[PDB]
Amino acid sequence: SKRIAWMKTTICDSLQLKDMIVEESFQYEKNKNLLEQFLSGEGLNKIFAYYQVQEQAQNDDIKDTGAQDPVLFFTTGDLEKIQDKAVWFLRITNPADDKKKASQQDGNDNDIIFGEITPNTVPMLNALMESVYSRQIDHIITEKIQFWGVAEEEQVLEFQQHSNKFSSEVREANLMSPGTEHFKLDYEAISGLSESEKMQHYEMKFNEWINLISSQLNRKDEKDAGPATELIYWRSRMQKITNWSEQLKSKDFQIVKASLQRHKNHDNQRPRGDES
């Protein structure tokens, strides 16, 4: 009961004022079973509740509670569960007896770990880690001596870099531009796809992609400008050709290719697979 009152107090200030649907979510039997098994179970270490939203004539908010945590599913577009708020509950100590005594006397604050995240944010997961754990590890390796402190800092930085890159990694507008109608969607011109103007626009855009990729696929002399500069440019080639590989592996840039194949305009499908 004390835990339920506490979570109710925690919920209101976060997104919106306390509601009867929020209370009914607690009153529901499944959420109670999950909370009880969580409190008394060494195995389950997390509780989740979804502030699910349903759009109709008017906006509606409902709350559910589950063990599974799909935090970025809601951020992914064109989903039923979109724009749904996420709550995290983590327990401190694994043993049931210690959880019991802590619920009886210890502060719910010390005893529970709480995490909140936006709905509809592509880099939210990358931002959380960087903002908290990257800072704590950096301070602590310096403060106290540990095994592999430098390796640990390096590892944290590498994950942070990957996570930061992958948010803006998604493809848009080297920079390879798809058609506006195609960025809308693929098969939106039932017979307008077989059009000279549209086909030639996709065709010239892909010719320009081919030229832009070639101008960089074609190195410097290994006798000049310094070994360090050479290594930097080799690493730049790696990351650069890698980013472009992901560019070409994007779906949309290959579907405009599939459209050129559907229109038989081979003079661009194939130079893309050969000259590049």
Q: How was this structure determined?
A: cryo-EM
Q: Resolution limit in angstroms?
A: 38.0
Helix, strand, or coil (residue 263): coil
Backbone angles phi, psi at 145, to 5 degrees: -80, 135
CB 77 within 8 A of CB 185: no
Under DSSP, is residue 260 helix (H, G, I), strand (E, B) or coil? helix
From start to end of the chain, where are the E strands?
A: 46-55, 59-66, 85-91, 112-117
Burial class of 153 by CB neighbour count within 10 A (0 to 12, 13 to 18, 19+): middle
In single-letter form, the type of residue at position 32 comes to K
Using CB atoms within 10 A of its CB, is residue 181 exposed (0-12), middle (13-18) or buried (19+)? middle
Q: What angle do CA 190, 194, 200 make, to 5 degrees?
A: 130
Partners of 91 in beta bridges: 112
Neighbour-count burial of 151, counting CB atoms closer than 10 A to its CB (0-12 exposed, 13-18 middle, 19+ buried): exposed
Q: Is the dihedral of CA 154, 157, 163, 169 positive or negative?
A: negative
| In contact, 246 and 254? CB cutoff 8 Å | no
Q: Torsion angle of alpha carbons 153, 156, 159, 164, nearest 10°? A: -100
Backbone angles phi, psi at 224, to 5 degrees: -140, 160
Residues 145, 148, 154, 157, Cα dihedral to 10°: -60
CA dihedral 171, 172, 178, 183 (to 10 degrees): 100
**What is the layout of strands, in order, in the sheet containing 112-117?**
59-66, 46-55, 85-91, 112-117
185-222 per-residue burial string, b: 16 or more CB within 10 A, e: under 16: ebeeeeeebeeeebbebbbebbeebbeebeeeeeeeee
What is the residue-wise DSSP string for 170-228? S------PPPHHHHH-SS--TTTTS-HHHHHHHHHHHHHHHHHHHHHH----TTSS-HH
Closest to 166 in 3D by CA, of 87, 72, 233: 72
13 contacts 77 by C-beta, under 8 angstroms: no
Which residues fall within 8 angstroms of residue 215, CB to CB, at 6 or more apart? none
Which among 251, 239, 237 has a CA at the least distance from the CA of 176? Answer: 251
> Residue 91 CB: number of other CB atoms within 10 A?
19
Other residues' Cβ atoms within 10 Å of the Cβ of residue 86: 21
Buried b (16+ CB within 10 A) or exposed e, 228-263: eeeeeeeeeeeeeeeebeebbeeebbebbbebbeeb
Q: How far is CA 35 from CA 25, 30, 84, in A?
A: 12, 9, 21
Closest among 136, 263, 135 to 203, alpha carbons compared: 263
Q: Identify the three-state secondary structure at position 247.
A: helix
Burial of 123 (0-12, 13-18, 19+ CB in 10 A): middle
- Rounded Cα distance, 244 and 58, in Å: 44
